[PDB]
Amino acid sequence: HIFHADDLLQALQQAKAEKNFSSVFSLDWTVKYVTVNVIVKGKKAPLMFNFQNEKHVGTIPPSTDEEVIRMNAENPKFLVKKRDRDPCLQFNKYKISPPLEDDGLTVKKNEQGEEIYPGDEEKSKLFQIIELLEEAFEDAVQKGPEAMKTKHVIKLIQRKISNNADKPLPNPIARIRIKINPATSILTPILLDKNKPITLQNTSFEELKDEDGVKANPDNIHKLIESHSIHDGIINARSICISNMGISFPLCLEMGVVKVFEKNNGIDVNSIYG
């Protein structure tokens, strides 16, 4: 079963207001995996949900040194290095950045000293879900068995720079992992092209493919998922991870439909000029 994002968000908002998270979030109590179940519109099932209209902001680094040279040769301010982990999708709290100063981290203020932030129409709904899943995971872990409660919990959402360091981000970040099978070197999720609707034996989309016609793979992916693309898909959050360093709540893309960024789209004043 796949929960619809809207229903899931509406059900974690109501549990949050009723101070009762275990009404919809429940864990089925080296490395070890434990199942995440959720109850939505009266249905209990392990946690898989969909998402729509989410703006990826970030640069997936490439896998070959040749591609590192090329990308850096035409973007000297924002250098990349060869990719040494699975790619991530990055979805911020706001779909547009709030007015920032020249140092790039301090948010401009207004007439009464109030920091400015975009209207709520610019709030990411997927981010709002991941915020409340983090609270549920948090609530769950300190309410469970004895051996786990005293262990280190790893956060879902980045709120400040790690290691200019440590200062708080004006637009925090949630990440969706795109897994590469390390034995086989095959990209795990199915990837489709929003711009290529197709006809169903029964209304689908063609597989996603690069300039030379090849399906998305680890050598492709940095070219096929660029910054400011719009994404729809399905997320697997079926289980938590327990080890040494603590407890994790990983989120992995299982299917995605991808729409590349285009300028002069939509009826607005930016399309009237240029």
SS (H, E, C) the chain: CCECHHHHHHHHHHHHHCCCHHHCEEECCCCEEEEEEEEECCEEEECEEEEEEEECCCCCCCCCHHHHHHHHHCCCCCCCCCCCCCCEEEEECECCCCCECCCCCCECECCCCCECCCCHHHECHHHHHHHHHHHHHHHHHCCCCHHHHCCCECCCEEEECCCCCCCEEEEEEEEEECCECCCCCCECCEEEEEEEEECCCCCEEEECECCCCCECCCCCHHHHCCCCCEEEEEEECCEEEEECCEEECCCEEEEEEEECCCCCCCCCHHHCCC
Radius of gyration of the chain (CA): 20
Amino acid making up residue 218: P
Residue 150 has a CB neighbour count (10 Å cut-off) of 7
Instruction: Look at the block and give the residue holding tokens 């709290």.
Output: 93
Q: How far apart are the first and last CA of the chain?
A: 46
Tokens of 123: 């709030």
- Taking alpha carbons only, the member of 258, 97, 67, 65 closest to residue 176 is 258
State residue 255 phi and psi, 5-degree precision: -145, 140
- Are β-strands 168-177 and 88-92 bridged in parallel, bridged antiparallel, or unpaired? antiparallel
Burial code of 26-40, b = ≥16 C-beta within 10 A, e = fewer?
bbeeeeeeeebebbb
Tell me the CB-side half-sphere exposure of residue 9, using CA atoms within 13 A.
Answer: 14
Resolution for this experimental structure (Å): 2.3
Angstrom distance (rounded) from CA 206 to CA 159: 37
- Taking alpha carbons only, the member of 90, 80, 4, 86 closest to residue 43 is 4
State residue 37 phi and psi, 5-degree precision: -110, 155
Angstrom distance (rounded) from CA 135 to CA 108: 29
Packing angle, helices 5-17 and 125-141, rounded to 10: 50
- Are β-strands 157-160 and 168-177 bridged in parallel, bridged antiparallel, or unpaired? antiparallel
Angle at 24 between CA 139 and CA 171, to 5 degrees: 60
Residue 153 has a CB neighbour count (10 Å cut-off) of 17
Q: How many residues does the chain have?
A: 274
Amino acid making up residue 7: D
33 in Cβ contact with 46 (< 8 Å) = no
- Taking alpha carbons only, the member of 177, 194, 179 closest to residue 232 is 194
